[PDB]
């Protein structure tokens, strides 16, 4: 029943900033910004997800 909001400069509901709610060791509900999920690499001929290759961000 405790209300939380964004922790960064962007105040709008954009795909860039998304919020999860977690209970901290202090006993309170707090917001946490979640990063964009990674995408599986795709085959260059048929476009299906490649098997046995890790799914990470471009720089990871």
């Amino acid at each position: 029943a405790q209300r939380v909001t964004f922790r960064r400069r962007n105040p709008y509901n954009t795909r860039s900033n998304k919020i999860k709610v977690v209970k901290t060791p202090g006993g309170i509900l707090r917001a946490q910004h979640v990063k964009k999920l990674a995408t599986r690499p795709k085959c260059g001929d048929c476009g299906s997800a490649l098997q046995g290759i890790s799914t990470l961000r471009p720089r990871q």
Binding site: G44, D45, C46, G47
Partner: protein, 220 residues
């Protein structure tokens, strides 16, 4: 090169004075039939003028009733003039037709002159005419698409954007050329009709007056 030689041979064989051996007459008839069949699809090709000239020379003969191909050639010319909307092929045929008529002092058969009645370029229809019921899938369904690379998709977008402007320009050019071809064809047709009237050929008056009534309101 080979098509040029073939068309030249057809034109040479078509010219037969009907006084040689019957074998040569049969050769000329078969050559005329071959040229008539060829022009149904080779009209948008090189050296169409030679085929048009030979076919019209066959048609514009003083006596054509004995020719077993005049019906077919007249039908083909009428179909060509009926299905041509832009007016390019129609003008190309009409120029040769006028050139041949001026040599013969405007002396043909009413039936021959009847081909000018089928000119589509000199016809106007409802802006919202109902075409034939044509049904096709509008777009390929999203779940049934073929995989394309990023470069392939970018090239597809670029070629689509080029094709759209090419289609727009093609429509504009066709619209602006139809009017000029219509004006030139009106000039030629009215000149032919007036020359026929001045010659006062008793067997061509009705067709001429029908042509004036049909195409009179299309002029200035």
């Amino acid at each position: 090169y080979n098509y040029k030689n073939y068309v030249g041979r057809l034109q040479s064989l078509s010219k037969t004075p009907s006084n040689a051996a019957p074998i040569q007459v049969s050769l000329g008839i078969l050559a005329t039939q071959a040229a008539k069949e060829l022009i149904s699809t080779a009209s948008h090709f090189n050296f169409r003028t030679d085929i048009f000239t030979l076919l019209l020379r066959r048609i514009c003969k003083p006596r054509i009733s004995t020719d077993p191909t005049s019906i077919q050639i007249i039908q083909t010319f009428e179909t060509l003039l009926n299905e041509d909307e832009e007016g390019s092929i129609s003008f190309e045929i009409l120029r040769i037709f006028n050139k041949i008529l001026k040599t013969r002092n405007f002396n043909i058969e009413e039936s021959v002159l009847n081909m000018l009645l089928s000119l589509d370029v000199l016809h106007d229809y409802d802006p919202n005419t109902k075409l034939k019921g044509n049904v096709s899938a509008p777009k390929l369904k999203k779940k049934d698409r073929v995989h394309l690379s990023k470069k392939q998709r970018k090239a597809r977008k670029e070629m689509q954007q080029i094709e759209e402007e090419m289609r727009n320009a093609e429509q504009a050019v066709s619209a602006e050329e139809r009017e000029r071809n219509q004006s030139e064809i009106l000039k030629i047709v009215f000149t032919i009709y007036l020359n026929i009237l001045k010659n006062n050929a008793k067997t061509l008056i009705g067709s001429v007056l029908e042509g004036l009534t049909k195409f009179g309101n299309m002029a200035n």
